[PDB]
């Protein structure tokens, strides 16, 4: 595998505004109508989160400072997963979360991630809903321990919060329909945990995995026609702050302050 695409496209970064977003349940204890104050890693309100586009193939190795907030508009399922790690190379144990069509596979291996990792996606003519995914993520995967498979994590805005504390990798999500044209919605929505993986590795950088179609084939290029659908994903950073987290009568977080 390991085909590299991004020759020279170096358009300067663009920042949108995560109005009031990336607020999760920092507890597994049900709370009735009460304003609760929590001190944990939250995405600050009205913070400039980067605005990446899938159509420039935008697979940059981004820092995992203290935990990231990941949100993707993604009208069609193209944002497929992540490659959290410290070096994203051998000699360093790394994490991989990807979901194919009906299940997510989470692996923590000594990956040899490609320079431009992604997935090729094809629709076989026998069933135009098959979406056969080919892995162009890593060249070698060996000498590892963890493996987790469950239902898939994923214009259908989809928000995530990955934070790596004391050996547990914690994932939160809230997949909600979106009609807004370009940027994050203004309404408040509280992410709720997906899994709590006993990973226990060192994570400092991370990179997203796109699902690119092979539109055309020049004979020898391998980098010819990898069109990238149309989507945009939004990477913010968690910081240690103290929210006052309001719970509904039904136990849901309907509003918060910073």
């Amino acid at each position, epitope marked *: *595998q*390991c*085909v590299n695409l991004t020759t020279r496209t170096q358009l300067p970064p663009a920042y949108t505004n995560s109005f009031t977003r990336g607020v999760y349940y920092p507890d597994k204890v049900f709370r009735s109508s009460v304003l609760h104050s929590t001190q944990d890693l939250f995405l600050p309100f009205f913070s400039n989160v980067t605005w990446f586009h899938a159509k420039r193939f935008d697979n940059p190795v981004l820092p995992f400072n203290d935990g990231v907030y990941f949100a993707s508009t993604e009208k069609s399922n193209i944002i497929r997963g992540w490659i959290f790690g410290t070096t994203l190379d051998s000699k360093t144990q790394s994490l991989l979360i990807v979901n194919n069509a009906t299940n997510v596979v989470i692996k923590v291996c000594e990956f040899q991630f490609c320079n431009d990792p992604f997935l*090729g996606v*094809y629709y*076989h*003519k*026998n069933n135009k809903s098959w979406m*056969e995914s*080919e*892995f*162009r993520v890593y*060249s*070698s995967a060996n000498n590892c321990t963890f493996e987790y498979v469950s239902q898939p994590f994923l214009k259908n805005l989809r928000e995530f919060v990955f934070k790596n504390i004391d050996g547990y990798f914690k994932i939160y999500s809230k997949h909600t329909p979106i009609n807004l044209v370009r940027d994050l919605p203004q309404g408040f929505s509280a992410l709720e945990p997906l899994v709590d993986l006993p990973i226990g590795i060192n994570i400092t950088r991370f990179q997203t995995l796109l699902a690119l179609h*092979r539109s*055309y*084939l*020049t*004979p*020898g*290029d*391998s*980098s*010819s026609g990898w069109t990238a659908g149309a989507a945009a994903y939004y990477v913010g950073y968690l910081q240690p702050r103290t929210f006052l987290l309001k719970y509904n009568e039904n136990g849901t977080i309907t509003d918060a302050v910073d």
Partner: antibody
Amino acid sequence: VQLVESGGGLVKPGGSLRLSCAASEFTFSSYSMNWVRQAPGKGLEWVSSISSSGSQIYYADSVKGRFTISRDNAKKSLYLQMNSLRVEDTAVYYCATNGGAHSSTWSFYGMDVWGQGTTVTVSS
Amino acid sequence: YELTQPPSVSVSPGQTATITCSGDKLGDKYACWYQQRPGQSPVLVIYQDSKRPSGIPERFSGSNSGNTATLTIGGTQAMDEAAYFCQAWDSNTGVFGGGTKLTVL
């Protein structure tokens, strides 16, 4: 990329050969590699295939158990061992890129890049 | 798995040629096509039953339906005199058609 074959030469039946197909560029790591042979006066015939990382290996029935394929992306090379050769294996052996990285994708591309094949004559 | 092709086809230059490839329910598979000039390496001219690689002229049109996938050469001329091999992948093992020579008068 460009492929150059080597290692094909005259041999008596039952011999052994190690075909080598060294790619021009290092993007050889991204192509599933295919061995296809053209009999001296007959049509084109598939022989073997290997995934891009080498984890998926498939052979034709007429060579299963006798040939073993491998690839070394570090040396950007493809290899074919011919164990227990027979006379009906004389051909010119092409190495052809596929483009799909795994066997589930081989059907979605074609053998787009072909190295100039090397002739293998298995006779007395 | 087996694919059948006519031994040869012949058309006048500038006409339309048609090389056919019949197989056991081939229309559910992707049939790629190759071109082999006499004594040269094959060149992929059609893949995925309709799509051409870059550099292959737009007059190379093919299709797949049912049990038969056909390749049609629009404006057949002198450089199209070569062997054409239908190809399909069954059980992760590729199969090549017989190879129908095309003669350009």
